[PDB]
Write a protein that binds this ligand. Structure first.
Ligand SMILES: *[C@@H]1O[C@H](CO)[C@@H](O[C@@H]2O[C@H](CO)[C@@H](O[C@H]3O[C@H](CO)[C@@H](O)[C@H](O[C@H]4O[C@H](CO)[C@@H](O)[C@H](O)[C@@H]4O[C@H]4O[C@H](CO)[C@@H](O)[C@H](O)[C@@H]4O)[C@@H]3O)[C@H](O)[C@H]2NC(C)=O)[C@H](O)[C@H]1NC(C)=O
Lengths: 179, 174, 13
């Protein structure tokens, strides 16, 4: 490849669902995604959105094109559907885990295809909505996706954690355990 | 339960900055790249049969061909020298280096950007390479990386870190 | 500075 890789357009659209995503990537990281509903450029790092700009109209236009093309390619292929994959999750901390020192648990899920997934956290087996953030789907060279979920937490001798991934490629949600 | 996915991407490959650029666009239907522009060829090509209706058609229309070609400058070159040089290429985040004991010393190097880094163990002033095990680069997904470097041994042991965000190396003694 | 993007060709079917 290269010293660097700019991906200056990623348009992903799916049917049914009418699910669109438009991102920019640089060296594997997400610069921004275009909030298609709000027509807004949403930067992964706030500072960046004040150092540079992107007109979200670009994203909307891109998705519109790909939406149309998907129609055409669906017919052109005799409506061949996507083949579901089984994703793979690994859990790890952002930092070395020190009791009573706040940290972030990361769930990385790879081999995501199609890009529809539930990634949610269990804290000793109850759903943990609070302090949870997720990334966009990042592109893989084999045209599957990866996605990360983050849980902020206070480490503790007394707490067990799971990353649970629900995907069509899996019959029932699957738990990835960390302690 | 039939599901369909389409992907379009414009990929810019840069070597020694913009001294060498390769521009590739890709049209993908359900993981099948079926048409591609590649600046190394200078025109669209069917990658598979699904792309046979498009590539030559697009090649016959001079404005399609001139516009796609020029994206090497108007997208790749423009982005790299403009926004990207003030954002991604200027970002420097210094690693945090902590040593702990697993038996083994573990040197955790966290929260740095960019990826280019050298972590070295030292026992009493000498660079050890034997019995040293580094992870791969771990991508946190948030414009930071981490690397954990194990020393199978424990003397004064020093974890030594080199990174573009640093005027001189971090040395952490144990 | 402004990020600019590739534009996909639209297919007629
Ligand atoms: C991932 O995570 C989500 C959240 O837990 C899982 O479940 C889905 O959640 C969606 C949003 O909360 C649910 O959809 C609602 O909205 C849609 C329109 O936006 C609506 O069509 C829908 O519901 C009915 O139909 C769907 C099938 O389309 C059924 O799955 C669903 O149970 C509904 O059933 C009722 O409707 C029948 C019509 O088909 C009717 O005959 C019956 O009376 C029946 O009670 C919802 O209003 C979404 O429904 C829900 N999906 C499922 C499968 O339960 C999601 O499944 C997870 N996905 C994974 C595993 O990847």
């Amino acid at each position: 490849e290269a010293d660097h890789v700019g991906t200056y357009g990623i348009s992903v659209y799916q049917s049914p669902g009418d699910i669109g995503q438009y991102t920019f990537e640089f060296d594997g990281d997400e610069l921004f995604y275009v909030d298609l509903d709000k027509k807004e450029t949403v930067w992964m790092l706030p500072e960046f959105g004040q150092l540079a700009s992107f007109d979200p109209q670009g994203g909307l236009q891109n998705i519109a094109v790909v939406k149309h093309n998907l129609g055409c390619l669906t017919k052109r292929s005799n409506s061949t559907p996507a083949t579901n994959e089984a994703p793979q999750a690994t859990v790890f901390p952002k930092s070395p885990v020190l009791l009573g020192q706040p940290n972030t648990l990361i769930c990385f899920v790879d081999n995501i295809f199609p890009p529809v997934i539930n990634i949610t956290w269990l804290r000793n087996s109850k759903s943990v909505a609070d302090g949870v953030y997720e990334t966009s789907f990042f592109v893989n060279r084999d045209y599957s996706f990866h996605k990360l979920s983050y849980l902020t937490f206070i480490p503790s001798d007394d707490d067990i954690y799971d990353c649970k991934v629900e995907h069509w490629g899996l019959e029932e949600p699957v738990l990835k355990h960390w302690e | 339960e039939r599901h369909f996915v389409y992907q379009f991407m414009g990929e810019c490959y840069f070597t020694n900055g913009t001294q060498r650029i390769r521009y590739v666009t890709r049209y993908i239907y359900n993981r099948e790249e079926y048409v591609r522009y590649d600046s190394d060829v200078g025109e669209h090509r069917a990658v598979t049969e699904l792309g046979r209706p498009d590539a030559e058609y697009w090649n016959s229309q001079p404005e399609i061909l001139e516009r796609t070609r020029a994206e090497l400058d108007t997208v790749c070159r423009h982005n790299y020298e403009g926004p990207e040089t003030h954002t991604s290429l200027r970002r420097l985040e210094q690693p945090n280096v902590v040593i702990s004991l697993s038996n083994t010393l573990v040197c955790s190097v966290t929260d740095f950007y960019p990826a280019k880094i050298k972590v070295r163990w030292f026992r009493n002033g000498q660079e050890e390479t034997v019995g040293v095990s580094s992870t791969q680069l771990i991508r946190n997904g948030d414009w930071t990386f981490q690397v954990l470097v194990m020393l199978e041994m424990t003397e004064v042991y020093t974890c030594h870190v080199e990174h573009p965000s640093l005027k001189s190396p971090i040395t952490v003694e144990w | 500075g402004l990020y600019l993007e590739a534009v996909p060709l639209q297919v007629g079917c």
